[PDB]
Design an enzyme around this catalytic site. Structure first.
Site, mmCIF file in Angstrom:
data_model
loop_
_atom_site.group_PDB
_atom_site.id
_atom_site.type_symbol
_atom_site.label_atom_id
_atom_site.label_comp_id
_atom_site.label_asym_id
_atom_site.label_seq_id
_atom_site.Cartn_x
_atom_site.Cartn_y
_atom_site.Cartn_z
ATOM 1 N N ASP A 139 0.808 -1.186 0.000
ATOM 2 C CA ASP A 139 0.000 0.000 0.000
ATOM 3 C C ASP A 139 0.869 1.276 0.000
ATOM 4 O OD1 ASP A 139 -2.589 1.540 0.126
ATOM 5 O OD2 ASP A 139 -2.389 1.494 2.299
ATOM 6 N N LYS A 142 2.341 3.316 -5.916
ATOM 7 C CA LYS A 142 1.760 2.299 -6.776
ATOM 8 C C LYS A 142 2.742 1.802 -7.825
ATOM 9 C CE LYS A 142 -1.387 3.286 -4.024
ATOM 10 N NZ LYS A 142 -1.210 2.620 -2.677
ATOM 11 N N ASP A 167 -3.503 -3.124 -1.959
ATOM 12 C CA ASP A 167 -4.529 -2.109 -2.024
ATOM 13 C C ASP A 167 -4.506 -1.365 -3.369
ATOM 14 O OD1 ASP A 167 -6.718 -0.610 -0.929
ATOM 15 O OD2 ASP A 167 -5.410 0.939 -0.109
ATOM 16 N N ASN A 168 -5.634 -0.779 -3.767
ATOM 17 C CA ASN A 168 -5.738 0.212 -4.808
ATOM 18 C C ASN A 168 -5.488 -0.366 -6.166
ATOM 19 O OD1 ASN A 168 -4.125 2.066 -2.332
ATOM 20 N ND2 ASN A 168 -6.208 2.565 -3.044
ATOM 21 N N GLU A 197 -11.799 4.470 -0.023
ATOM 22 C CA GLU A 197 -11.995 5.118 1.288
ATOM 23 C C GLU A 197 -12.530 6.577 1.209
ATOM 24 O OE1 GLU A 197 -8.858 3.845 0.048
ATOM 25 O OE2 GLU A 197 -7.276 5.293 0.626
HETATM 26 O O1 LIG Z 1 -1.068 7.104 -3.356
HETATM 27 C C1 LIG Z 1 -1.583 6.351 -2.455
HETATM 28 N N1 LIG Z 1 -0.773 5.744 -1.595
HETATM 29 C C2 LIG Z 1 0.648 5.958 -1.564
HETATM 30 C C3 LIG Z 1 1.149 5.659 -0.191
HETATM 31 C C4 LIG Z 1 2.290 6.114 0.281
HETATM 32 C C5 LIG Z 1 2.781 5.805 1.650
HETATM 33 O O2 LIG Z 1 3.834 4.837 1.589
HETATM 34 C C6 LIG Z 1 5.044 5.385 2.186
HETATM 35 N N2 LIG Z 1 6.160 4.702 1.628
HETATM 36 C C7 LIG Z 1 6.887 3.734 2.292
HETATM 37 C C8 LIG Z 1 7.945 3.091 1.793
HETATM 38 C C9 LIG Z 1 8.397 3.389 0.415
HETATM 39 O O3 LIG Z 1 9.410 2.907 -0.073
HETATM 40 C C10 LIG Z 1 7.591 4.346 -0.321
HETATM 41 C C11 LIG Z 1 6.537 4.990 0.276
HETATM 42 C C12 LIG Z 1 4.842 6.898 1.882
HETATM 43 O O4 LIG Z 1 5.856 7.656 2.593
HETATM 44 C C13 LIG Z 1 3.391 7.126 2.297
HETATM 45 O O5 LIG Z 1 3.266 7.065 3.724
HETATM 46 C C14 LIG Z 1 -3.042 6.174 -2.373
HETATM 47 C C15 LIG Z 1 -3.824 7.058 -3.026
HETATM 48 C C16 LIG Z 1 -5.224 7.039 -2.989
HETATM 49 N N3 LIG Z 1 -6.055 7.964 -3.736
HETATM 50 O O6 LIG Z 1 -7.221 7.779 -3.843
HETATM 51 O O7 LIG Z 1 -5.518 8.934 -4.243
HETATM 52 C C17 LIG Z 1 -5.909 6.008 -2.245
HETATM 53 C C18 LIG Z 1 -5.072 5.136 -1.556
HETATM 54 O O8 LIG Z 1 -5.648 4.116 -0.794
HETATM 55 C C19 LIG Z 1 -3.660 5.154 -1.567
HETATM 56 O O9 LIG Z 1 -2.943 4.268 -0.937
HETATM 57 MG MG LIG Z 2 -4.149 2.593 -0.257
#
Ligand SMILES: O=C(NC/C=C/[C@H]1O[C@@H](n2ccc(=O)cc2)[C@H](O)[C@@H]1O)c1cc([N+](=O)[O-])cc(O)c1O
Ligand SMILES: [Mg+2]
Length: 213
Positions: A139, A142, A167-168, A197
């Protein structure tokens, strides 16, 4: 003052300490009513819960902690002695997640790893006493789902029966990963349809009646 600190503060003010369910409910209320945020949410969360209960994993890896919502969700269902490791590249998110877990009373079960997944994955076995993973929750960014899955395999972290849960996969979508796993004889895939969500989005009409020059 960030949205993420506001979520944590709301939890500290309203949820019951040592009560993981209360913490999840406080997060869901705040994000439903006050500010959207990318927590998995209760609809998909129920699905996660059902999958975790089915497999009863001893060792779970989470990619992407964010505010700790999914770490709380998962760790509250782990059996005694089971462990969750969660990888978070943003130190501000890592701190929030640790405070969230602390408040919930789940800190003994969960280890936060600070760093980019691709840098941390190759250090798991030696530094965190890991053999293979029972379950992986994806999660994070992406575009990293597929390259990190490949790296997990490379590093010998997957065994027959390791469950990946992502997820997603519809919105925002993970199209390379989804195509890959669905087309690969190394994976057996099942889709669980749900809802994104916190999507009760307020908008409104403005009436403005001209009064003359
Ligand atoms: O973009 C989304 N998620 C990206 C998540 C990113 C998380 O993962 C961490 N991380 C940790 C370790 C790493 O190596 C890289 C990032 C980042 O620092 C942040 O805390 C997303 C977007 C939507 N949306 O509707 O827009 C809905 C969702 O459920 C989502 O998950
Ligand atoms: Mg998500």
């Amino acid at each position: 003052d960030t949205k993420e600190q506001r979520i944590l503060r709301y939890v500290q003010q309203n949820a019951k300490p040592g009560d993981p369910q209360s913490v999840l409910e406080a997060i869901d209320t705040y994000c439903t009513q006050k500010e959207w945020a990318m927590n998995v949410g209760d609809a998909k969360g129920q699905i996660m819960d059902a999958v975790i209960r089915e497999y009863s994993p001893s060792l779970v890896l989470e990619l992407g902690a964010y505010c700790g919502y999914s770490a709380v969700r998962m760790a509250r269902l782990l059996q005694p002695g089971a462990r969750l490791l969660t990888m978070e590249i943003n130190p501000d998110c890592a701190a929030i997640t640790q405070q969230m877990l602390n408040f919930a009373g789940l800190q003994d079960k969960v280890t936060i790893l600070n760093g980019a997944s691709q840098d941390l994955i190759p250090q798991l076995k030696k530094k965190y006493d890991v053999d293979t993973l029972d379950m992986v929750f994806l999660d994070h960014w992406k575009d990293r789902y597929l390259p990190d899955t490949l790296l997990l395999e490379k590093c010998g972290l997957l065994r027959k029966g390791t469950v990946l849960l992502a997820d997603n996969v519809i919105v925002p979508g993970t199209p390379d990963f989804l195509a890959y796993v669905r087309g690969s004889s190394s994976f057996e895939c099942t889709h669980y349809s749900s809802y994104l969500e916190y999507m009760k989005v307020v908008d409104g009409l403005e009436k403005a009646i001209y009064q003359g020059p």
